């Protein structure tokens, strides 16, 4: 099975981490 | 009225001049080859180059007045000779009365000590010219330059905690990114060593510039991994697997570090070794525990060399890291060696 990450960081810091 | 940084610098250089002291002179003259003239040439060349770049503007760095340039420079020169004397005096060969010509004739050491002194002076004054400005100006390889930092810290005890912290900070900058650039002398040193990268055990318990460098790299990385593995899950001391994976990438994929950042490979090691080991396993929200580390900056995971072009950390993980490291990762398994973690 693939170990690829399906995800993104295109969000912004405020959202991503508050 | 002065800042405690500038006040401290003033008391370090007090009663001292732009020149070698009589003591240091004696040391110079007890050498079969008296370094004093070539040392003076070096300071003069560094001095000209410094002032030229200090004075002329760029888009990033507007130029300043020659009078300040000259003042920063005289302070650094005073600092230079005081520290050089201390270094030479405390040196083993002097204690045993052995000719120090060879030690004193190494140009890269003198250039580095002087640049480090300029860096100290600039930092004390809260200069806008931010490291690595001084070594770019003076054409000094990070991979060579960083070794002078430990020398400076141990040879000048008048340095304030903040000063030492700043010197350690720029050492970490060199260890994490600056020394890994494609034009770094690191790659040359690697080359004459037949591209054999020191393992962690090899540099713990070799000894060339390559060994000392990777020793400091592994130490730095272990400190950052240990902190990371003490914040989020927080981790099993395995994390011997994450470390082992990281070491695998330094040793068997050193090209992955070229023009990259040490934490990018550390965090990818964390992610991939999380996933495979069926523990825990964590999403790239690892950044939360990472962003709290002092060296962490948005550019570290938001701008990562890919091929121009650039992308985020996850993208780098998907397009590059996975293909290179998955053969290793998959052996930790559903269907065995580990690297000793330094403490």
Short mmCIF file of C-alpha atoms in Angstrom, two decimals:
data_model
loop_
_atom_site.label_atom_id
_atom_site.label_comp_id
_atom_site.label_asym_id
_atom_site.label_seq_id
_atom_site.Cartn_x
_atom_site.Cartn_y
_atom_site.Cartn_z
CA UNK A 1 0.00 0.00 0.00
CA UNK A 2 1.14 3.54 -0.76
CA UNK A 3 2.56 5.75 1.95
CA UNK A 4 1.61 8.91 0.12
CA UNK A 5 -0.04 11.66 2.17
CA UNK A 6 -3.37 12.65 0.63
CA UNK A 7 -3.39 16.00 2.38
CA UNK A 8 -2.58 19.70 2.12
CA UNK A 9 -1.15 22.69 3.92
CA UNK A 10 -2.56 25.20 1.45
CA UNK A 11 -4.63 26.44 4.36
CA UNK A 12 -3.30 29.28 6.49
CA UNK A 13 -1.68 29.27 9.89
CA UNK A 14 -4.60 30.89 11.67
CA UNK A 15 -6.85 28.09 10.44
CA UNK A 16 -4.30 25.27 10.48
CA UNK A 17 -3.15 26.03 14.00
CA UNK A 18 -4.94 28.42 16.35
CA UNK B 1 22.88 54.62 28.22
CA UNK B 2 24.32 51.88 26.01
CA UNK B 3 22.51 48.58 25.54
CA UNK B 4 23.91 45.85 27.78
CA UNK B 5 25.12 44.11 24.63
CA UNK B 6 27.08 47.13 23.42
CA UNK B 7 28.16 47.93 26.97
CA UNK B 8 29.50 44.38 27.32
CA UNK B 9 31.35 44.65 24.01
CA UNK B 10 32.88 47.95 25.15
CA UNK B 11 34.18 46.41 28.37
CA UNK B 12 35.63 43.45 26.46
CA UNK B 13 37.75 45.68 24.22
CA UNK B 14 38.58 48.32 26.86
CA UNK B 15 42.25 49.29 27.02
CA UNK B 16 42.94 47.22 23.91
CA UNK B 17 44.05 48.35 20.48
CA UNK B 18 43.59 47.65 16.77
CA UNK B 19 46.81 45.60 16.79
CA UNK B 20 48.42 42.46 18.25
CA UNK B 21 49.49 42.82 21.88
CA UNK B 22 53.15 42.44 22.87
CA UNK B 23 52.34 38.96 24.20
CA UNK B 24 50.77 37.84 20.92
CA UNK B 25 53.66 39.41 19.04
CA UNK B 26 56.06 37.25 21.07
CA UNK B 27 54.00 34.22 20.09
CA UNK B 28 54.17 35.33 16.46
CA UNK B 29 57.94 35.79 16.64
CA UNK B 30 58.49 32.35 18.22
CA UNK B 31 57.18 30.82 14.99
CA UNK B 32 59.61 29.66 12.29
CA UNK B 33 57.20 31.38 9.93
CA UNK B 34 55.95 34.59 11.54
CA UNK B 35 52.25 34.87 10.57
CA UNK B 36 52.00 38.56 11.51
CA UNK B 37 52.27 39.99 7.98
CA UNK B 38 49.85 37.59 6.30
CA UNK B 39 47.45 38.06 9.20
CA UNK B 40 47.59 41.81 8.63
CA UNK B 41 46.96 41.32 4.91
CA UNK B 42 43.94 39.17 5.69
CA UNK B 43 42.42 41.75 8.04
CA UNK B 44 43.10 44.47 5.49
CA UNK B 45 41.46 42.51 2.65
CA UNK B 46 38.51 41.59 4.85
CA UNK B 47 38.38 45.20 6.00
CA UNK B 48 38.20 46.64 2.50
CA UNK B 49 35.64 44.12 1.30
CA UNK B 50 33.52 44.65 4.42
CA UNK B 51 33.42 48.44 4.03
CA UNK B 52 32.70 48.21 0.29
CA UNK B 53 29.61 46.05 0.81
CA UNK B 54 28.61 47.89 3.99
CA UNK B 55 28.61 51.22 2.12
CA UNK B 56 26.95 50.30 -1.18
CA UNK B 57 23.20 49.65 -1.32
CA UNK B 58 21.24 46.66 -2.57
CA UNK B 59 17.50 46.03 -2.84
CA UNK B 60 17.59 43.97 0.36
CA UNK B 61 20.16 46.03 2.26
CA UNK B 62 20.45 49.84 1.99
CA UNK B 63 24.03 51.08 2.44
CA UNK B 64 25.32 52.85 5.54
CA UNK B 65 27.94 55.52 6.22
CA UNK B 66 31.67 54.75 6.04
CA UNK B 67 32.20 56.17 9.55
CA UNK B 68 30.06 53.46 11.08
CA UNK B 69 31.71 50.85 8.83
CA UNK B 70 35.10 51.92 10.12
CA UNK B 71 33.85 51.88 13.71
CA UNK B 72 32.33 48.41 13.47
CA UNK B 73 35.54 47.26 11.82
CA UNK B 74 37.95 48.64 14.43
CA UNK B 75 35.88 46.98 17.16
CA UNK B 76 35.98 43.65 15.32
CA UNK B 77 39.75 43.97 14.81
CA UNK B 78 40.27 44.60 18.51
CA UNK B 79 38.04 41.64 19.25
CA UNK B 80 39.98 39.59 16.70
CA UNK B 81 43.43 40.13 18.24
CA UNK B 82 42.23 39.67 21.83
CA UNK B 83 40.51 36.39 21.03
CA UNK B 84 43.38 35.20 18.81
CA UNK B 85 45.83 35.78 21.64
CA UNK B 86 43.62 33.84 24.05
CA UNK B 87 43.27 30.99 21.54
CA UNK B 88 47.01 30.81 20.90
CA UNK B 89 47.94 31.15 24.56
CA UNK B 90 45.61 28.31 25.63
CA UNK B 91 46.67 26.07 22.74
CA UNK B 92 48.33 22.76 23.66
CA UNK B 93 51.36 23.33 21.45
CA UNK B 94 52.17 26.61 23.18
CA UNK B 95 51.87 24.96 26.59
CA UNK B 96 54.44 22.41 25.44
CA UNK B 97 56.57 25.07 23.78
CA UNK B 98 56.02 23.76 20.28
CA UNK B 99 56.30 25.81 17.10
CA UNK B 100 52.84 27.03 16.12
CA UNK B 101 53.64 28.16 12.54
CA UNK B 102 51.26 25.63 10.96
CA UNK B 103 48.34 26.52 13.22
CA UNK B 104 48.91 30.22 12.64
CA UNK B 105 49.30 29.96 8.86
CA UNK B 106 45.82 28.58 8.16
CA UNK B 107 44.02 31.32 6.22
CA UNK B 108 40.49 29.93 6.61
CA UNK B 109 40.85 30.08 10.39
CA UNK B 110 41.93 33.71 10.44
CA UNK B 111 39.25 34.75 7.93
CA UNK B 112 36.64 32.92 9.99
CA UNK B 113 37.72 34.35 13.34
CA UNK B 114 37.61 37.87 11.89
CA UNK B 115 34.20 37.32 10.26
CA UNK B 116 32.88 35.90 13.53
CA UNK B 117 34.11 39.04 15.29
CA UNK B 118 32.37 41.24 12.75
CA UNK B 119 29.27 39.12 13.34
CA UNK B 120 29.53 39.64 17.12
CA UNK B 121 29.92 43.41 16.71
CA UNK B 122 27.04 43.62 14.24
CA UNK B 123 24.74 41.54 16.44
CA UNK B 124 25.60 43.65 19.50
CA UNK B 125 24.50 46.76 17.61
CA UNK B 126 21.37 44.98 16.34
CA UNK B 127 22.56 45.33 12.74
CA UNK B 128 20.03 44.98 9.93
CA UNK B 129 22.67 42.94 8.14
CA UNK B 130 21.62 39.50 9.23
CA UNK B 131 23.71 36.34 9.17
CA UNK B 132 24.75 34.95 6.80
CA UNK B 133 25.35 38.46 5.42
CA UNK B 134 28.91 38.70 6.75
CA UNK B 135 30.16 35.40 5.31
CA UNK B 136 28.50 36.02 1.96
CA UNK B 137 30.22 39.38 1.79
CA UNK B 138 33.57 37.86 2.76
CA UNK B 139 33.21 34.73 0.58
CA UNK B 140 33.42 32.28 3.48
CA UNK B 141 32.11 28.71 3.22
CA UNK B 142 29.64 27.94 6.03
CA UNK B 143 31.04 24.39 6.18
CA UNK B 144 34.48 25.84 7.02
CA UNK B 145 33.32 28.89 8.94
CA UNK B 146 31.09 27.21 11.56
CA UNK B 147 34.04 25.52 13.33
CA UNK B 148 35.33 28.89 14.51
CA UNK B 149 32.13 29.46 16.50
CA UNK B 150 32.89 26.89 19.20
CA UNK B 151 36.42 28.26 19.42
CA UNK B 152 35.15 31.82 19.94
CA UNK B 153 32.65 30.82 22.62
CA UNK B 154 35.27 28.90 24.59
CA UNK B 155 38.02 31.51 24.08
CA UNK B 156 36.03 34.57 25.15
CA UNK B 157 34.16 34.35 28.45
CA UNK B 158 33.30 38.03 28.44
CA UNK B 159 30.59 37.14 25.93
CA UNK B 160 27.09 37.58 27.37
CA UNK B 161 24.59 34.70 27.42
CA UNK B 162 22.76 36.42 24.56
CA UNK B 163 25.95 36.61 22.50
CA UNK B 164 26.71 32.92 23.03
CA UNK B 165 23.10 32.07 22.21
CA UNK B 166 23.35 34.03 18.95
CA UNK B 167 26.62 32.30 17.98
CA UNK B 168 25.07 28.91 18.69
CA UNK B 169 22.06 30.05 16.71
CA UNK B 170 24.07 30.80 13.57
CA UNK B 171 25.94 27.52 14.05
CA UNK B 172 22.60 25.74 13.94
CA UNK B 173 21.66 27.70 10.79
CA UNK B 174 24.80 26.40 9.12
CA UNK B 175 24.17 22.84 10.33
CA UNK B 176 20.52 22.78 9.26
CA UNK B 177 20.63 24.48 5.83
CA UNK B 178 23.55 26.77 4.90
CA UNK B 179 26.21 24.05 4.70
CA UNK B 180 24.03 21.81 2.56
CA UNK B 181 23.73 24.20 -0.39
CA UNK B 182 24.77 22.83 -3.78
CA UNK B 183 27.95 24.94 -3.84
CA UNK B 184 28.99 24.02 -0.28
CA UNK B 185 32.50 22.69 0.37
CA UNK B 186 30.68 19.93 2.26
CA UNK B 187 30.06 18.14 -1.03
CA UNK B 188 33.76 18.35 -1.85
CA UNK B 189 34.77 16.88 1.50
CA UNK B 190 32.23 14.14 0.94
CA UNK B 191 33.75 13.59 -2.51
CA UNK B 192 37.34 12.95 -1.35
CA UNK B 193 35.87 10.58 1.23
CA UNK B 194 34.37 8.62 -1.67
CA UNK B 195 30.88 9.90 -0.87
CA UNK B 196 30.83 7.86 2.34
CA UNK B 197 28.61 9.65 4.84
CA UNK B 198 29.43 9.15 8.53
CA UNK B 199 26.84 7.06 10.32
CA UNK B 200 25.82 8.22 13.77
CA UNK B 201 27.74 5.48 15.57
CA UNK B 202 30.88 6.30 13.58
CA UNK B 203 30.96 9.88 14.91
CA UNK B 204 29.97 9.07 18.51
CA UNK B 205 32.27 6.34 19.88
CA UNK B 206 36.98 9.09 11.20
CA UNK B 207 37.65 12.48 12.84
CA UNK B 208 38.08 14.69 9.76
CA UNK B 209 36.08 17.81 9.04
CA UNK B 210 33.44 15.52 7.61
CA UNK B 211 33.20 13.58 10.88
CA UNK B 212 33.06 16.68 13.11
CA UNK B 213 30.37 18.24 10.91
CA UNK B 214 28.09 15.21 10.86
CA UNK B 215 28.69 14.75 14.59
CA UNK B 216 27.21 18.22 15.17
CA UNK B 217 24.46 17.52 12.63
CA UNK B 218 23.36 14.27 14.30
CA UNK B 219 23.47 15.92 17.71
CA UNK B 220 21.35 18.83 16.52
CA UNK B 221 18.85 16.51 14.84
CA UNK B 222 18.60 14.24 17.89
CA UNK B 223 17.82 17.22 20.12
CA UNK B 224 15.05 18.34 17.78
CA UNK B 225 13.67 14.81 17.37
CA UNK B 226 13.70 14.19 21.11
CA UNK B 227 11.78 17.42 21.71
CA UNK B 228 9.32 16.58 18.93
CA UNK B 229 8.94 13.07 20.36
CA UNK B 230 8.38 14.63 23.76
CA UNK B 231 5.53 16.95 22.56
CA UNK B 232 2.77 15.42 20.27
CA UNK B 233 1.85 11.70 20.84
CA UNK B 234 4.06 11.70 22.73
CA UNK B 235 6.33 9.16 21.38
CA UNK B 236 7.58 5.79 22.29
CA UNK B 237 11.28 5.98 22.68
CA UNK B 238 10.81 4.35 19.24
CA UNK B 239 11.52 7.06 17.66
CA UNK B 240 14.57 4.80 17.33
CA UNK B 241 12.90 3.93 14.06
CA UNK B 242 12.29 7.55 13.14
CA UNK B 243 15.91 8.27 13.98
CA UNK B 244 17.10 5.24 12.03
CA UNK B 245 15.07 6.37 9.04
CA UNK B 246 16.48 9.89 9.27
CA UNK B 247 20.02 8.51 9.48
CA UNK B 248 19.29 6.33 6.45
CA UNK B 249 18.41 9.44 4.46
CA UNK B 250 21.52 11.36 5.55
CA UNK B 251 23.81 8.42 4.78
CA UNK B 252 22.16 6.70 1.80
CA UNK B 253 20.32 9.67 0.31
CA UNK B 254 22.59 12.64 1.02
CA UNK B 255 21.48 14.35 -2.20
CA UNK B 256 18.07 14.85 -0.56
CA UNK B 257 19.71 17.42 1.72
CA UNK B 258 21.23 19.44 -1.09
CA UNK B 259 19.79 22.98 -0.96
CA UNK B 260 17.30 21.74 1.63
CA UNK B 261 16.66 22.04 5.38
CA UNK B 262 17.55 19.45 8.01
CA UNK B 263 14.10 19.59 9.62
CA UNK B 264 12.39 18.73 6.32
CA UNK B 265 14.06 15.31 6.30
CA UNK B 266 13.55 14.91 10.04
CA UNK B 267 9.82 15.60 9.80
CA UNK B 268 9.42 13.31 6.78
CA UNK B 269 11.25 10.59 8.68
CA UNK B 270 8.80 11.23 11.50
CA UNK B 271 5.79 10.99 9.19
CA UNK B 272 6.78 7.94 7.15
CA UNK B 273 8.03 6.00 10.16
CA UNK B 274 4.84 6.92 11.92
CA UNK B 275 2.72 5.54 9.08
CA UNK B 276 4.42 2.19 8.52
CA UNK B 277 4.90 1.20 12.16
CA UNK B 278 1.09 1.29 12.70
CA UNK B 279 1.82 3.70 15.51
CA UNK B 280 0.30 6.21 15.96
CA UNK B 281 0.21 7.27 13.14
CA UNK B 282 0.35 11.05 12.75
CA UNK B 283 -0.67 13.54 10.06
CA UNK B 284 1.67 16.43 9.13
CA UNK B 285 -0.04 18.33 11.99
CA UNK B 286 3.33 17.34 13.48
CA UNK B 287 4.04 21.02 12.72
CA UNK B 288 2.15 22.06 15.85
CA UNK B 289 4.83 20.52 18.04
CA UNK B 290 7.44 21.59 15.52
CA UNK B 291 6.43 25.24 15.11
CA UNK B 292 7.09 25.70 18.82
CA UNK B 293 10.78 24.93 18.26
CA UNK B 294 12.85 28.14 17.97
CA UNK B 295 14.39 27.35 14.57
CA UNK B 296 10.98 26.58 13.06
CA UNK B 297 9.79 29.02 10.42
CA UNK B 298 6.89 28.95 7.96
CA UNK B 299 9.32 28.70 5.03
CA UNK B 300 10.62 25.41 6.44
CA UNK B 301 7.43 23.45 5.69
CA UNK B 302 5.73 25.92 3.30
CA UNK B 303 8.57 26.34 0.80
CA UNK B 304 10.51 23.21 -0.06
CA UNK B 305 12.77 22.59 -3.03
CA UNK B 306 11.26 20.09 -5.46
CA UNK B 307 13.10 20.12 -8.80
CA UNK B 308 11.96 26.11 -10.69
CA UNK B 309 10.12 24.82 -8.67
CA UNK B 310 9.09 24.88 -4.99
CA UNK B 311 6.23 23.51 -2.91
CA UNK B 312 5.05 22.65 0.59
CA UNK B 313 6.37 19.88 2.83
CA UNK B 314 3.59 17.38 2.07
CA UNK B 315 4.19 17.83 -1.64
CA UNK B 316 7.91 17.19 -1.18
CA UNK B 317 6.94 14.14 0.86
CA UNK B 318 4.71 12.77 -1.90
CA UNK B 319 6.75 13.56 -5.01
CA UNK B 320 10.29 12.98 -3.72
CA UNK B 321 10.66 11.55 -0.21
CA UNK B 322 8.26 8.59 -0.53
CA UNK B 323 9.91 7.17 -3.65
CA UNK B 324 13.38 7.34 -2.12
CA UNK B 325 12.66 6.14 1.42
CA UNK B 326 9.75 3.69 1.10
CA UNK B 327 12.00 0.69 0.41
CA UNK B 328 13.59 1.31 3.80
CA UNK B 329 10.38 2.19 5.65
CA UNK B 330 8.42 -0.88 4.56
CA UNK B 331 10.87 -3.29 6.23
CA UNK B 332 9.47 -2.29 9.63
CA UNK B 333 6.73 -4.68 9.29
CA UNK B 334 3.42 -6.49 9.17
CA UNK B 335 4.64 -9.18 6.79
CA UNK B 336 14.99 -4.93 11.66
CA UNK B 337 18.22 -3.02 12.34
CA UNK B 338 18.02 0.16 14.42
CA UNK B 339 20.45 3.05 14.92
CA UNK B 340 21.60 3.96 18.44
CA UNK B 341 19.96 7.22 19.53
CA UNK B 342 22.40 9.66 21.17
CA UNK B 343 21.59 10.91 24.69
#
